[PDB]
Amino acid sequence: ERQFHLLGYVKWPKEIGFYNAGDNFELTPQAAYRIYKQNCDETFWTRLHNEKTIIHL
Amino acid sequence: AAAIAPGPYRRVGNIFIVHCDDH
Amino acid sequence: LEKAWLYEDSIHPHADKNPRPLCWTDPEVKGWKYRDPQFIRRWKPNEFMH
Amino acid sequence: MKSVFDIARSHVTFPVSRDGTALRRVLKDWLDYTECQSLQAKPAFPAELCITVHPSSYTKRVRLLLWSAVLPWEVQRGLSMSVLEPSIIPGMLFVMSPESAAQGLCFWSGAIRQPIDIAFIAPVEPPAADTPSFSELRQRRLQLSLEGYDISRFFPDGELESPTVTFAVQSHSYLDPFPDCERRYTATPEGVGRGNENVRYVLETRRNLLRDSIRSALRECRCTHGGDVEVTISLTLSDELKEDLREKARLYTNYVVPLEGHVRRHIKCLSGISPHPPIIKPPLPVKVGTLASTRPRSPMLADEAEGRPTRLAPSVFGRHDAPALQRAQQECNQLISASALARIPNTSPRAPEIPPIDYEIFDLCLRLGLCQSEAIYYFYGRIMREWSKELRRLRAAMVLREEDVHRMLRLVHDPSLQVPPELSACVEAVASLRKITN
Amino acid sequence: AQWVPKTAWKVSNLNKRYGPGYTHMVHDSHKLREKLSSRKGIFVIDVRDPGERKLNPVPRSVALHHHDLLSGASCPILPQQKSAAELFVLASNESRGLNSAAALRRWGYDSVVQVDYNTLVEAGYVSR
Amino acid sequence: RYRTAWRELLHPLPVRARKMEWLKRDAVEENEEILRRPYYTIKSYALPPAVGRQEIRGGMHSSHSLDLIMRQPRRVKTPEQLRALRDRLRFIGVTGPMPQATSVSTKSYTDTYGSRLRPRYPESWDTVPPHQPSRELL
Amino acid sequence: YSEARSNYDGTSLPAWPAPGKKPTYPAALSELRLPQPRMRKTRTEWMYYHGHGGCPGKYGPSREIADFEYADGTPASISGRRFAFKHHQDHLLVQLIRAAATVERYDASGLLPRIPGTAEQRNWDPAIPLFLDGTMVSHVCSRVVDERMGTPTHTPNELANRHEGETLEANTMFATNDPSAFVS
Amino acid sequence: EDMPLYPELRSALRQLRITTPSPIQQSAVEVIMQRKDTVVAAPHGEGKTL
Amino acid sequence: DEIQRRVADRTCVQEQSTREVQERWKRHVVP
Amino acid sequence: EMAPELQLEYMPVLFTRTILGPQGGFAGEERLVKLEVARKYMEAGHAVTPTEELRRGLWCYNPDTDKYDCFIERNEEFLDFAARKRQWLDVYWRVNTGYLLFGRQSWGQGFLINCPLRKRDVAQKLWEQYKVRIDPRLIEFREKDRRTGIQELGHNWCWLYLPGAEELGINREVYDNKRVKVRIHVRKMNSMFALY
């Protein structure tokens, strides 16, 4: 837990994302769609962001 | 309330309670 | 000392004893400091002279 | 419109390091901009006041035109001798220093024409972005920044560039004008933001603006209560307003600090402070040390040479009697006794020459906030002594000119400033006995 | 506007050449009289010799010693509201007046004005 | 910081001992602060005694009732009331005669039972009377 | 039966608040004048707070209340140690009364000075402001104790040689009026 | 010259042809001028008389 | 934001070809 | 005002040259100095007998040309300025001349102190054995002492900054008119004067 909080990662609820069997941070498709709906028109959003949202869906 | 306390004045001293804390 | 059963693996023949899992808290739980974050203050309608 | 940037573009040519009249002209022009120009003639920039309604959401925004006060004269003047009104609501935005914010911020109704409502706000970051990792990232970015202003005093958190920061009103208060120029005359933040280093922005505007806006925003509140509601007040700045704030901070950092240094040098010059074989061997300057000679004998003795004299010690090269030693001391002008050397200093007995008091510079510093502490420390005692002596002469019945008397009388009767009561009373008594008014 | 602190003006006393000492000696009789007649209370403390204050009695005045004032033995008698309270130190010696003013400032009373017996008489606070 | 790194190795006491020594220093400073107070304090008859007090806040202390008594206004308002209460104060074991202003038939306990005789006091754990009335005479 | 008194009269403060109101809690921190360090009260400090001076069985109800009584209500007898404890309480009260009477007679005679502290304390502590304008073996012992404990340190003879009667004067050119310099 | 002497004593020293004080005179002259009971201890022939 | 600010120091083109377009889209759609 | 039996041991003296010490004075001061000290001063030439014309005006020592050709009229403001400059030079001389002794406790024969010395204690000892009232803010510890203090047992020192020197013109005679070197000596004293 000390190393986790030192690197600076956050414990999100399971509805958002979680560390899967390979300890990779997998993001929920619902969470990805909501992140898209919020950050549609931001400056950093890109074609690759839309592609990854479709990938998660 | 912004003025000096009226009436006569009484002088009040003090007393000490001393407790020995070391040998 | 004989009341200790040491097994380098999880396999042990003490299944008929039903050993209850022993849970102990390490006394070192200090964070050594914790400053509270700054949050946006929430105001009440009657607070503004009402 | 006349702006501080135009004033600096005009002052670009005045030689301040070589002349004193040019520095006086610069201070006079800044005093003209501060007192002779109208607040309506000074440029303003738009901003919005968001009010989020949480039932436990509805948001209402108000159009505000804010005057930015970043320079010291603007900050100390405020809404003094000016009016807000001669769909958008006028206002004034004060940007304080972290040094002054760590201390208790206190505002006062100094020569205001209208009762004002002030709001102490702070730039707050979301909790997810408020972690020490993002804080360290912001610190590294500010250290690597190439901007003009000093990051230590102006925006030490990057709230102008942070995409997630929001300027939240952490406290509010009001200021009522004095009965002479037109019941709380002072205001300090309380509750949340008490002694907070993040509360560095003040917003002065029309009285009861917050309450009126909250009342106009709360419309469903009646039904939600008939069938507890919270309010969140935040301030959003336009891009042009943020650019003006950044430009004022840069102008401060790059112009006022050298201007303050020139004012300090001028005050020092006006106070009189200007920068710069025999048997007895006198003290001589230590020879220049080589690499190994300057290198100590041990790494622990590196701090031993912290405090060392730059001159050697006097010495006697032989064994002599007392009359011979005294004759040698008299011939070499060097005493042997360290006690005698310490007790008999070679100092000038006359007082250093000091030019007369510059009431113009004193008044300019007191009215512009530039080197105010230096001006006080260097001239307050002189002025008090001169006026006390003149008052003694007048009571027993000059050196004090009528122009200086008029300047001091105006400075004392200025409502926008506060002078000590002893100085005010002394000036008033001297004027009343010398038959000088206004 | 931002309020300049009262302690910002204390940097003048740090001048080693024109320091205060190493002075409210001038008062308009009419102004002092109207101020006292508007206050209508006990705001005058006289710090002077007992024989002196017996020779020149001043009613409605508090007879205290400057050493007591400096030590703080008169704090419960002091007005206890150091903001709005203004005190008048009556001393025949200007040095004693300055010392009493310094003691009151140390205990938290900045609004302290030094008055003279002749000034008080010509203002009419002391009856005859 | 070689000198500091070397000084860190030089310590006669552990951290707890150093903390105790610093607490002792704070106690000495408290004694000095208490001794720096004046000998007396000029007060008034009307105002409560806890008005000119020079002074871990918000919680109740062991002197709560004492502070309440010090904060409540004084019960003797004027020296006239002071003397009107003190003149009726009577001393029994005082050496000397006492007046008979009010009543004549009323005799004193000593006038009735001499000076060597005492009333039989109930002697119990709660009632401890002054045994041996002859030891009290110097 | 059973007796429970924390006071001589048996009176006390209301132990319980009004129904539905927040209670009052004692100060948990040790009563140290400095704001830091902050330390929770020890058990001995809590005993001192609640009135049992130091340890249990001393200056509290556990010692003042009678140990037993007969079933018909008859109280116990007076023990010698009980009489000694009553005399000890009387001795404390007599100490208090005599000290207060001494202070009162000193104030009446005018022996209480207007300057706080003694001359040694004024010469040692700079936080105090400047106030300007039979047998004899025991007496000799007091005099030598005073001579040994009056001046703990001397001014170096290089500045003022005390053998010639030279003394230094107070140089208050860099002094301050506010006590915050010594308080903080 | 560092010790206080009257002009008549200065002339007496010049008459006796004495300029520099001996170690006993450097120490004992000051103590006696302070009016203290002094024990002037020095070897033979060091100016103990003066 | 931190990524973009650290990349723009050693970026290829010094102009605002794409970032100004992104800012225009934001200013036109978001508010 | 001094009693005659005491004043018999003094004599009025006008100081021609500034002299630091308990029996010294600034140039142009009328001072009652002891008999022997005044004799030494008048023999060295640093003082004269206060005649009336001398009290009006007196020639003082000029350090620029090393002669007594600097005439000075004794005025009120001049006496004030000279008294203040003399106070500054006197406190500098007191602080820079001798040591400052601190008797403290140290468990065993260690090298450090139990409770480190702070600016409050330094100012306390300054006032105690030098009769100098300052505020602790003017004291500056060394770089190795910024963290803890004078915890080291033995010979130590710190800086004492004296701000008001340029207004008085004390930049030439003093080696450093901005700060003084306060030699401090800490001694392990377990006697009654430990208190720590």
Ligand SMILES: Nc1ncnc2c1ncn2[C@@H]1O[C@H](COP(=O)(O)OP(=O)(O)OP(=O)(O)O)[C@@H](O)[C@H]1O
């Ligand atoms: N400062 C001086 N310089 C040179 N000569 C000196 C000085 N003082 C004393 N003398 C000479 O030293 C001689 C001896 O002096 P003095 O009689 O004091 O010695 P003494 O110690 O008394 O010897 P003794 O103990 O044998 O009597 C004298 O004749 C004197 O001239």
